[PDB]
Amino acid sequence: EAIAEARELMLVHKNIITPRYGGPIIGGGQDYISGAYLLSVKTTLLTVEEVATILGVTDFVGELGEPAILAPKPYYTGKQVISLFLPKDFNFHGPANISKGPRACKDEICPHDSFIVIKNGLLLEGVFDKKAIGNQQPESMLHWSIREYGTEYGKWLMDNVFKMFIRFLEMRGFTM
Amino acid sequence: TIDKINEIFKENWKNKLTKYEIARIISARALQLSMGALPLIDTSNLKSDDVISIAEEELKRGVLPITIRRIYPNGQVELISVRKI
Amino acid sequence: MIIPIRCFTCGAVVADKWEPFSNRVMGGEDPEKVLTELGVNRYCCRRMLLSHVNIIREIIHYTRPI
Amino acid sequence: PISLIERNGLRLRLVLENYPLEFVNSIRRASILYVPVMAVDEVYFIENNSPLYDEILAHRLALVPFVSDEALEHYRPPEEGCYNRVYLDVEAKDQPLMIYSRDLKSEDQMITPVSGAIPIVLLGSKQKISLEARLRLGYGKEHIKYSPVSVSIVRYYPKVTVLGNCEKAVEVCPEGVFAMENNKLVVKNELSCILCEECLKYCAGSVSIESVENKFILEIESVGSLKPERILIEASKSLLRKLSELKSKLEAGK
Amino acid sequence: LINALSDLRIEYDGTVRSLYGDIVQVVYGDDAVHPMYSAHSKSVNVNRVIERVIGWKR
Amino acid sequence: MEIKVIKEEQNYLELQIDGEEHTIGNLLKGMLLKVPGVKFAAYSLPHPLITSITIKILTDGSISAREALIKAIELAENYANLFIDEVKKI
Amino acid sequence: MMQGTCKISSIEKGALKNLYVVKMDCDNDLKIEFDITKELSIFSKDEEVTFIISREKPEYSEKDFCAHGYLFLERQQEDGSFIDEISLYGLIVKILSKNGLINSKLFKMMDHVYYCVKKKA
Amino acid sequence: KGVVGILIDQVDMPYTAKGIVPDIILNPHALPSRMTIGQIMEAIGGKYAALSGKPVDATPFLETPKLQEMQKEILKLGHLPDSTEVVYDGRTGQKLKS
Ligand code: F3S
Ligand SMILES: [Zn+2]
Ligand SMILES: [Zn+2]
């Protein structure tokens, strides 16, 4: 009975959102945020081999699809790689954490990809930051996704996508 | 008719099952299966031999006969069935 | 205590180079040229040869009887 | 195709023209790991009065490399029972005695330490040491004392071109890839480039740096246990053995 | 605080009466919404629902 | 080396190899990406403390995933043989 | 749909570190500003090219620029011209023209579509 | 201060063009919140000390040599002035983008 009560009530994924406030207590640390940001920059481009290495860590098998850039060279954008994990009906229009000062235009038209635009499960614009996947951040993209698709989807997304972020930061190079 | 929110609460929890009641049902069924009670679902074709997993799958299916009687503070008692025939 | 047989970073033998390097540096030659012509170009081995203490010379006096 | 750049003592540099990066990386990894080299496995201590404890001395003996070019065929690999034996039995008289690897008597005369200048331990006055080490072939995967190469590098093939004369590029670049002769900027060591892009960063228009897709530069530095060419051959043989065994298991499963 | 507040419980009618029977609140939080399941401090973020429905054509 | 097969199909295969580190997995991933017909091939080290890899192959359906893996092994063997032959003359 | 000859005006340095904005003047008072990266820089200033935006996949060559993305952000400026932004999975192509894409019923909102710009030779 | 997260083999560690692999890898995110610039200064000083072989004095308020001369000498010996260097991924063999 103790084991059953521990499993059905105190499992970690069921308690992702803290009772203190309506926000996720589990989320991207400092390194996950940097990896997600560098993967979600508008300028990133990934070849087929790099995409395969990135997605190897995740437990994802499926059709990659046509690369976002077909000519001159086949390139997969980091947002395209990310969008394979978002649910196919998920809409978000929040600003990113980088739009916290002068560089913010408070609109989805800013040339700086500081405004997260996700439509039908496609990361069309913006970058992931502390305000997108960060821990202790209520009303974030991760918080909305968990609240709308259950803690089991929350755990699945965390594992796979965050391992992908760390792998990309491994293969790009982050130093001081 | 204590308040509108009280009525909303009461009509909401009539047809649903709280996580405490789910945990109690699963623990009771697991304890029963451990002592030697015969499972109702098909034993074979299950990836997990754990008793807890079998009880959880039984609860998800709804085969196990368990009725939860909740006693309201005013004396009203509500019976909720898990059979889901 | 005693110089390691191999460089910690890369498994390159530096123990045999302790005596020549130490003797020539103590003789009055700058360690850079001695290291360069001795055959250690990676600074991982240079820190092995440069930052050594040779405690074993003092310990042989204070040795456990056993 | 494979083209030799420089063949120094215990060093080998090659250019591979048509090989995927995955294969070349597997070659370097197998050179570090999957090439057998004879090294000390167990040590029997009859007597030890040395300042170094038994485990420290055994570790130092294990880290000493032995030449084993002819021992690969005469001794069974660890996956298969034949171990060599090496004796060390000395004693100081009145003054400290630094005993080197040259006084490591071996049962098999062909197997000797790489260099006799390696200092094993220093003995105080009237200190006697006596031990027998049992050498055994092993791969670098089990322990790092079995690795035949001190370092193995696989890097991209550089293509650096000078576009005009620039005086800064000769002093910007850490490598000697640039030279200033007769008031002209030329490339002396094109293959010594590491694609640092400082050369491109300070003088962007004067120099163009690119990487050649098909070619790669593979460098290995041995420790004296094996010839570098033999190290590469043994690494490729180990890869072949693993691939053949995997293919056999896949066929059996089918 | 824990020793003072340990006895409170949520009942089946929405009240927060203690185990000794003393009622503390007729309704918990005035809307019977647990903070864990609320969108931050809001039971329902209406703008979030609007997004969920018409964000693709927003 | 032990071998285990998971979720095997005509176009999709997963296969856990026990006893091989990053080297064999990366070699096989490269050769699988080289052989035509393979839509998506990737290896993974589930835990670095445990020396066991997992290779996931998804094929367009023209050739079987197991056959694609065998072709990749053949390509790797050909490359190794050519490398040996070229080194020996050097 | 919506194909025409055009001349590129300038290649801006761009907001990001490795992003260049290619500005393009087309016919019928149409302008296109699309983002490129250092590798995707097959374009030179004052060159005349031709662009196509079609639901179906068109023919392309290694010397061409081809991509696919989802159209979104239909807006009407206070002036009266319409502004559209097609997202090549992150790479923004910004189209300013009269009688915008969704207004003229050429495309639906959030529809997959290929954008291909090719040099003239 | 910190525990050892994992022990990584020489083959797996990211090697440089000269083949020198790290002995200890430290997360850059530990630096900016703790504001320990002395650690990077000591890293550069140790690299210069190993390369040039000359002694390094880092006594507060008076260091010999200064940072700029150390960087210039590091460039002279054969490495990058800013103590960075080209690193290839050990597992896959691919050069890091930075
Ligand atoms: S060493 Fe070589 S290729 Fe470029 S930046 Fe430095 S020159
Ligand atoms: Zn901005
Ligand atoms: Zn070294």
Side-chain angles (χ1 to χ4, degrees), chain A, chain B residues 2-85, chain C, chain D, chain E, chain F, chain G, chain H:
Chain A
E1 282 182 326
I3 290 165
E5 293 179 353
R7 283 188 48 180
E8 307 311 313
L9 288 169
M10 305 171 46
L11 214 52
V12 178
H13 73 85
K14 303 177 187 297
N15 306 297
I16 287 189
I17 291 186
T18 176
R20 200 181 83 180
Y21 53 93
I25 201 59
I26 300 182
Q30 68 271 16
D31 189 313
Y32 294 92
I33 289 174
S34 298
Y37 165 78
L38 290 186
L39 185 51
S40 277
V41 176
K42 184 187 305 185
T43 69
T44 188
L45 294 172
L46 295 159
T47 67
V48 182
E49 293 80 13
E50 298 180 15
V51 160
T53 62
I54 282 182
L55 290 185
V57 294
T58 76
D59 220 348
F60 181 76
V61 176
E63 301 88 31
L64 278 176
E66 295 179 352
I69 304 299
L70 294 170
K73 313 195 207 283
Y75 280 125
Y76 285 84
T77 300
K79 302 179 178 57
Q80 175 186 10
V81 162
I82 286 185
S83 292
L84 316 175
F85 295 93
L86 295 187
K88 300 324 292 172
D89 48 348
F90 181 59
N91 297 295
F92 188 63
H93 278 266
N97 191 25
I98 59 177
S99 78
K100 61 180 186 178
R103 295 191 296 105
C105 295
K106 307 282 291 186
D107 202 358
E108 65 183 1
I109 199 168
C110 185
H112 308 90
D113 48 4
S114 65
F115 201 88
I116 302 177
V117 168
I118 301 184
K119 291 185 174 185
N120 273 349
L122 302 154
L123 179 61
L124 290 181
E125 209 180 3
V127 301
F128 287 148
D129 277 330
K130 189 176 63 180
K131 293 191 67 175
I133 70 165
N135 53 347
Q136 294 179 356
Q137 199 76 23
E139 301 190 4
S140 68
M141 183 225 79
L142 181 145
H143 170 233
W144 292 131
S145 63
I146 292 182
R147 196 196 186 208
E148 300 161 5
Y149 294 93
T151 46
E152 67 275 16
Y153 161 79
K155 163 181 59 63
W156 176 88
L157 181 87
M158 292 219 175
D159 309 331
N160 301 300
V161 182
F162 287 55
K163 288 185 67 178
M164 166 176 72
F165 290 152
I166 300 312
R167 187 62 183 85
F168 176 77
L169 200 59
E170 293 179 354
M171 65 179 288
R172 173 204 171 273
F174 211 66
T175 182
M176 181 85 168
Chain B
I2 297 169
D3 204 17
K4 168 158 141 154
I5 301 300
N6 271 25
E7 309 208 41
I8 300 170
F9 196 81
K10 286 160 75 132
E11 321 306 319
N12 173 221
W13 279 122
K14 263 163 41 63
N15 297 299
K16 217 190 308 173
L17 194 63
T18 78
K19 69 185 169 66
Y20 303 114
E21 310 203 316
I22 291 184
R24 183 60 221 170
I25 286 187
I26 287 185
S27 51
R29 189 50 186 176
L31 190 44
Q32 292 178 355
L33 288 188
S34 66
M35 321 295 298
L38 272 194
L40 310 194
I41 60 167
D42 294 334
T43 298
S44 54
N45 304 2
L46 204 53
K47 34 196 163 186
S48 51
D49 291 331
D50 199 10
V51 168
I52 316 287
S53 307
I54 300 171
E56 182 186 330
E57 167 74 3
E58 268 174 41
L59 176 50
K60 286 200 260 184
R61 204 157 304 200
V63 293
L64 73 165
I66 288 191
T67 311
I68 310 186
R69 53 170 309 112
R70 34 183 65 173
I71 309 102
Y72 281 52
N74 66 21
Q76 171 178 338
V77 299
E78 291 204 27
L79 316 168
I80 286 166
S81 185
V82 186
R83 283 319 299 297
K84 287 156 44 188
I85 290 184
Chain C
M1 185 180 288
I2 185 72
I3 182 159
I5 300 288
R6 296 204 203 174
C7 173
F8 299 132
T9 287
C10 68
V13 286
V14 298
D16 47 36
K17 300 178 183 303
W18 174 244
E19 309 278 18
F21 163 83
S22 179
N23 290 347
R24 301 185 45 178
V25 159
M26 203 186 288
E29 309 172 2
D30 49 348
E32 163 188 307
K33 314 291 191 93
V34 184
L35 287 174
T36 300
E37 65 183 1
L38 210 68
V40 298
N41 274 267
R42 287 181 294 277
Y43 59 88
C44 67
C45 307
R46 300 201 170 196
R47 71 143 166 80
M48 291 275 318
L49 286 168
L50 283 174
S51 59
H52 186 241
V53 286
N54 202 35
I55 294 155
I56 193 76
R57 179 77 49 182
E58 319 191 43
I59 285 187
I60 60 188
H61 313 297
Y62 314 101
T63 317
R64 64 191 200 300
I66 197 168
Chain D
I2 293 180
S3 311
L4 202 165
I5 297 169
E6 280 167 344
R7 188 203 295 238
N8 303 146
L10 295 191
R11 206 166 321 110
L12 184 63
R13 309 176 64 189
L14 312 176
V15 169
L16 278 69
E17 196 166 4
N18 267 327
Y19 292 100
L21 177 53
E22 296 80 5
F23 175 77
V24 180
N25 198 28
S26 63
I27 292 299
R28 72 157 273 275
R29 296 183 58 101
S31 314
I32 298 188
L33 293 162
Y34 295 138
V35 176
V37 161
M38 281 216 88
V40 171
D41 186 74
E42 281 185 332
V43 186
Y44 304 70
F45 285 104
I46 311 176
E47 190 82 6
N48 191 12
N49 296 356
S50 166
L52 289 181
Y53 300 115
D54 303 354
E55 68 274 15
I56 320 172
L57 191 67
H59 187 250
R60 289 189 68 79
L61 287 165
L63 281 193
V64 165
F66 296 80
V67 64
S68 56
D69 63 358
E70 280 136 30
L72 263 70
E73 51 255 20
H74 281 77
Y75 292 85
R76 299 159 186 165
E79 58 91 21
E80 203 278 335
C82 203
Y83 304 170
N84 200 21
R85 285 189 307 173
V86 160
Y87 294 120
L88 185 144
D89 180 333
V90 298
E91 178 174 0
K93 315 281 301 313
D94 188 14
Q95 293 184 120
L97 179 70
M98 180 72 106
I99 60 174
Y100 297 92
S101 77
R102 51 167 174 261
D103 72 82
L104 269 164
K105 307 310 182 297
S106 177
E107 171 166 349
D108 196 1
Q109 283 54 40
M110 40 185 266
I111 306 176
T112 61
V114 172
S115 51
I118 296 176
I120 294 301
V121 70
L122 176 51
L123 291 166
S125 314
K126 293 188 289 185
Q127 293 181 352
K128 174 162 201 103
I129 194 168
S130 176
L131 61 94
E132 155 192 333
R134 285 231 61 171
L135 278 65
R136 168 192 67 90
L137 277 165
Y139 301 72
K141 182 94 200 283
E142 174 187 353
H143 205 277
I144 201 65
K145 60 178 179 186
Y146 296 120
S147 80
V149 289
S150 73
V151 75
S152 76
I153 300 92
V154 166
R155 55 184 187 96
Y156 291 168
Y157 198 89
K159 183 186 197 309
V160 62
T161 61
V162 293
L163 323 172
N165 190 355
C166 192
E167 295 185 4
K168 203 168 192 174
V170 65
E171 69 207 10
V172 175
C173 194
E175 311 276 10
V177 68
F178 293 124
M180 185 64 72
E181 283 147 309
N182 64 28
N183 200 359
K184 180 192 178 184
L185 183 71
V186 287
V187 286
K188 273 282 161 283
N189 300 78
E190 184 180 352
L191 263 50
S192 196
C193 179
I194 66 174
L195 309 174
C196 49
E197 302 199 24
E198 292 291 328
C199 311
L200 190 54
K201 186 171 79 70
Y202 283 141
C203 47
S206 301
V207 180
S208 176
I209 297 89
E210 277 207 295
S211 70
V212 176
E213 303 265 337
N214 63 7
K215 293 183 184 176
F216 301 101
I217 301 182
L218 161 59
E219 293 179 353
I220 65 168
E221 185 166 12
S222 177
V223 303
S225 298
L226 286 167
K227 308 204 323 293
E229 303 87 346
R230 184 142 180 71
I231 296 175
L232 292 182
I233 292 302
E234 283 296 330
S236 312
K237 282 179 185 168
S238 308
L239 284 185
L240 276 176
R241 290 202 289 259
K242 293 193 165 305
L243 290 161
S244 295
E245 181 185 40
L246 176 50
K247 188 178 182 181
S248 298
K249 300 196 89 71
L250 269 182
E251 290 172 350
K254 195 193 305 182
Chain E
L1 289 174
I2 285 185
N3 283 130
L5 283 155
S6 68
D7 315 299
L8 305 191
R9 189 186 49 177
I10 300 289
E11 311 272 338
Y12 282 96
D13 54 338
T15 51
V16 187
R17 66 188 67 189
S18 51
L19 293 193
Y20 307 95
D22 283 297
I23 190 168
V24 177
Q25 271 179 306
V26 286
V27 192
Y28 169 73
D30 292 331
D31 48 357
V33 167
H34 200 274
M36 210 193 195
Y37 317 127
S38 72
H40 203 184
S41 181
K42 300 178 177 180
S43 59
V44 167
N45 197 351
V46 184
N47 295 341
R48 183 47 203 167
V49 168
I50 302 285
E51 260 176 30
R52 296 181 53 180
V53 174
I54 61 179
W56 54 281
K57 55 175 183 178
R58 200 77 188 90
Chain F
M1 51 176 286
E2 301 307 309
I3 187 167
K4 180 184 173 183
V5 188
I6 315 169
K7 266 162 153 273
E8 213 283 335
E9 269 191 332
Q10 180 195 345
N11 58 359
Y12 173 45
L13 187 152
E14 191 166 335
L15 195 143
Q16 180 198 18
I17 301 91
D18 288 83
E20 321 275 19
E21 202 206 20
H22 277 281
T23 179
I24 287 297
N26 192 18
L27 186 53
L28 274 195
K29 193 190 93 71
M31 310 315 168
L32 291 183
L33 278 180
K34 270 175 88 82
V35 60
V38 169
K39 290 185 62 60
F40 168 82
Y43 80 106
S44 67
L45 198 53
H47 210 267
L49 288 172
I50 307 170
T51 181
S52 158
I53 62 170
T54 300
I55 306 187
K56 302 171 288 293
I57 312 163
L58 180 72
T59 318
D60 198 22
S62 65
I63 190 167
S64 185
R66 182 175 291 254
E67 296 298 330
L69 194 47
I70 294 192
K71 295 228 178 275
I73 300 179
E74 299 169 2
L75 292 182
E77 291 176 90
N78 295 0
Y79 273 120
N81 288 326
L82 178 56
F83 182 86
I84 294 184
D85 296 341
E86 261 156 20
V87 169
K88 290 204 73 59
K89 65 179 73 174
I90 290 297
Chain G
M1 311 185 223
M2 172 145 278
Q3 63 253 20
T5 73
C6 63
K7 177 197 86 84
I8 70 169
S9 308
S10 64
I11 302 182
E12 273 273 353
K13 185 63 70 176
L16 277 296
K17 72 178 86 151
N18 208 36
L19 186 144
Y20 312 116
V21 181
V22 180
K23 288 182 174 55
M24 185 180 288
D25 189 358
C26 317
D27 63 352
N28 64 257
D29 294 328
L30 194 151
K31 313 165 191 173
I32 294 176
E33 293 179 353
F34 61 96
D35 292 331
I36 68 171
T37 296
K38 180 181 175 182
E39 311 106 320
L40 298 174
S41 195
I42 48 154
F43 283 129
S44 302
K45 183 176 174 67
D46 273 338
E47 157 190 0
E48 192 145 350
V49 298
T50 58
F51 81 101
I52 185 168
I53 305 171
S54 287
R55 264 171 221 150
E56 294 294 328
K57 185 185 191 180
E59 281 79 351
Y60 59 85
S61 299
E62 197 255 330
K63 44 173 151 203
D64 294 338
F65 179 69
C66 169
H68 60 98
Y70 292 82
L71 195 150
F72 77 105
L73 188 153
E74 189 69 35
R75 285 191 165 185
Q76 170 155 23
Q77 295 191 8
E78 291 296 90
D79 189 358
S81 66
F82 293 71
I83 190 167
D84 302 343
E85 291 215 0
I86 188 168
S87 193
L88 296 174
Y89 281 93
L91 279 179
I92 296 298
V93 182
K94 174 180 172 179
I95 301 177
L96 309 97
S97 67
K98 273 76 182 172
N99 293 320
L101 285 162
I102 307 167
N103 192 20
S104 58
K105 277 76 69 185
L106 290 192
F107 294 95
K108 286 294 188 60
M109 180 83 95
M110 199 40 61
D111 69 322
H112 185 258
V113 59
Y114 297 81
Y115 168 78
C116 299
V117 64
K118 311 180 290 296
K119 317 191 258 214
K120 289 214 292 189
Chain H
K1 50 168 170 298
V3 291
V4 181
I6 195 175
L7 296 173
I8 298 197
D9 305 330
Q10 178 182 341
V11 294
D12 291 331
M13 298 208 95
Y15 61 95
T16 63
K18 294 197 58 58
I20 313 169
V21 286
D23 286 351
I24 294 171
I25 301 191
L26 187 150
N27 195 0
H29 297 94
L31 277 296
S33 192
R34 283 81 191 290
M35 291 145 58
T36 309
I37 316 303
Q39 183 143 50
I40 305 106
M41 287 210 168
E42 175 181 16
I44 301 190
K47 189 168 185 180
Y48 158 86
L51 280 160
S52 65
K54 298 157 60 84
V56 173
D57 200 41
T59 298
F61 325 120
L62 60 86
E63 311 96 10
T64 61
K66 304 181 65 61
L67 202 65
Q68 302 65 240
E69 291 82 3
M70 271 195 318
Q71 294 181 345
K72 291 183 178 301
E73 185 82 3
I74 285 184
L75 178 55
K76 201 211 70 184
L77 270 295
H79 288 85
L80 277 296
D82 52 356
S83 182
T84 54
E85 51 178 282
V86 163
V87 166
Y88 292 75
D89 194 355
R91 298 166 301 180
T92 66
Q94 297 152 344
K95 180 169 68 64
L96 267 51
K97 290 141 201 210
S98 70

